[PDB]
């Protein structure tokens, strides 16, 4: 049998994970500043709570996914806005007001200057998950790492986990639903359409 | 086409009972120790893992199989020399409260008392920090694929390297031919064979 390994993030994983994060959104679209996608979606976890990050490796020891289990959502989104967004703004300048001109990088850079955080559901769902998988990862492996990260959060006293899932990820949404997640509402994560989904414990 | 997904993750206090069970089943060649350590079977876990759980639980990683069964553990001790200073100065008082000193009749000793004696007559492993800063522990049930064992060892070594380790040692039971072959196949060398808390060990090591 193919052995997948789920293991803690190590700092040396960063470049590989930024590349996966770019591919999952891909590396053909963002040719000027490929790092901007990871900066938006992954860097905050690496900076604030790297111990939240689990990495998924396939049978050939290749990184094919990650999952962040964020114990304290409220604190995460607060510090995202106050600590991380300040940093990525300083790295990714506001583009000119001509929306026509804009490269894909410039759409995302502009989105950093127009941030609204998702609804605080932290009193009902303490925690949240962030996940990205290669199209190759078996669904049963995705279910395993989800079941793992939910046990980890519950073991740390979480009473519930939300997730902002890209609305277009039909297959992934079906996996979360089948595990007991329900759709709460839609939310725009900067330039990105999401469904806010959630589960108790 | 068939897939299993293993988790390596930090120890949580709730793991202790299952880990102690794995230690007990693993401690004697071709025997679960559950039928020999009839009086105080927790003395095995206390010997094998107690010092880590007490002093440095962050050193302990637990392996889960595809259906959440704990099927192994490893310890990555970044600084062996400090770890065994703490083992002597802090842990030995605690483990001697859990396990009494045997009476002076060696002939009549239970398996528990043979182990308990080691706690009252402790000597730290050879100090090999001139070559190897860190040390390991590793125990896997029968179910764990060797390819997973190797990947999980490498993870602990990569973690130690990242934290500044230039090398790792390990005491392995000399009778554990299979696990010794795995470590040797990964580039570990045998430095020494010597009794360490009443058990015949090989001290093995790799540079990082």
């Amino acid at each position: 049998s193919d052995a997948y390994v789920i293991r803690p993030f190590m700092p040396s994983d960063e470049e590989t994970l930024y590349d996966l994060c770019l591919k999952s959104c891909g590396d053909e679209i963002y040719k000027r500043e490929p790092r901007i996608i990871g900066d938006r979606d992954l860097g905050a976890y690496i900076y604030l709570h790297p111990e939240y990050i689990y990495v998924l490796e396939d049978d050939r020891d290749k990184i094919c996914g990650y999952l962040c289990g964020a114990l304290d959502s409220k604190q995460f989104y607060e510090r995202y806005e106050s600590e991380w967004l300040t940093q990525i703004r300083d790295r990714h300048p506001q583009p000119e007001n001509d929306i026509a001109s804009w490269t894909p990088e410039e759409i995302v850079a502009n989105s950093f200057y127009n941030f609204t955080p998702p609804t605080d559901v932290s009193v009902l769902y303490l925690s949240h998950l962030e996940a990205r998988f290669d199209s190759s990862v078996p669904e049963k492996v995705i279910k395993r790492i989800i079941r793992f990260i939910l046990e980890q959060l519950k073991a740390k006293g979480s009473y519930g986990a939300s997730m902002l899932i890209d609305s277009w990820r039909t297959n992934l949404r079906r996996i979360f639903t089948s595990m007991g997640f329900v759709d709460l509402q839609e939310y725009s994560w900067m330039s990105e359409q999401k469904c806010m989904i959630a589960i108790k414990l």
Side-chain angles (χ1 to χ4, degrees), chain A:
Chain A
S1 309
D2 284 356
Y4 292 70
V5 171
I6 300 151
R7 60 148 174 96
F9 167 90
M10 310 190 59
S12 64
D13 294 328
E14 185 170 333
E15 167 192 315
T16 301
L17 292 188
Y18 262 60
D19 184 40
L20 190 143
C21 177
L22 170 63
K23 286 159 165 30
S24 74
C25 79
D27 47 330
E28 210 239 347
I29 311 164
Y30 304 91
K31 293 167 151 152
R32 305 288 306 290
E33 287 274 295
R35 166 207 176 72
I36 200 166
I37 300 301
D39 279 345
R40 185 190 62 212
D41 286 348
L42 177 58
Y45 295 98
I46 293 177
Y47 180 73
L48 294 176
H49 292 297
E51 75 282 11
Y52 284 176
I53 306 173
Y54 276 82
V55 170
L56 177 66
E57 294 164 343
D58 67 14
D59 185 66
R60 315 258 167 110
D61 213 21
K62 180 167 61 46
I63 289 176
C64 55
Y66 66 83
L67 189 38
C68 320
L71 185 59
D72 181 0
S73 290
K74 160 170 157 74
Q75 174 172 297
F76 176 79
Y77 288 114
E78 278 172 0
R79 296 178 72 192
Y80 186 95
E81 189 161 8
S82 71
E83 297 177 41
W84 182 254
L85 195 52
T86 56
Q87 299 191 53
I88 63 172
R89 279 173 186 167
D90 281 352
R91 164 177 299 280
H92 304 284
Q94 162 78 244
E96 60 172 25
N97 69 22
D98 176 6
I99 288 43
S101 63
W102 292 354
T103 65
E105 279 83 344
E106 287 178 334
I107 290 170
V108 174
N110 177 71
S111 78
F112 299 163
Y113 299 84
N114 298 286
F115 182 74
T116 308
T119 304
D120 183 353
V121 301
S122 77
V123 195
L124 293 179
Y125 310 97
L126 184 64
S127 308
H128 74 265
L129 309 187
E130 179 55 52
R132 293 285 193 289
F133 302 102
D134 280 357
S135 62
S136 81
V137 175
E139 296 188 332
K140 140 177 158 71
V141 177
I142 294 176
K143 298 194 84 174
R144 160 99 189 82
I145 191 172
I146 293 168
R147 175 178 85 246
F148 165 62
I149 199 56
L150 290 183
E151 279 308 344
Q152 278 300 101
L153 291 167
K154 181 194 287 151
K156 298 284 249 168
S158 184
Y159 48 79
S162 66
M163 168 171 178
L164 305 180
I165 185 159
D166 290 300
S167 296
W168 59 264
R169 300 186 186 279
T170 308
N171 289 339
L172 193 53
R173 283 178 72 178
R174 181 164 66 251
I175 293 168
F176 279 93
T177 300
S178 79
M179 302 187 79
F181 287 76
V182 297
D183 292 12
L184 299 183
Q185 58 194 33
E186 295 227 277
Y187 163 67
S188 294
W189 175 248
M190 285 160 285
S191 64
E192 298 305 289
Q193 306 307 301
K194 314 270 197 187
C195 185
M196 182 184 300
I197 68 173
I199 201 183
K200 297 297 285 145
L201 310 207

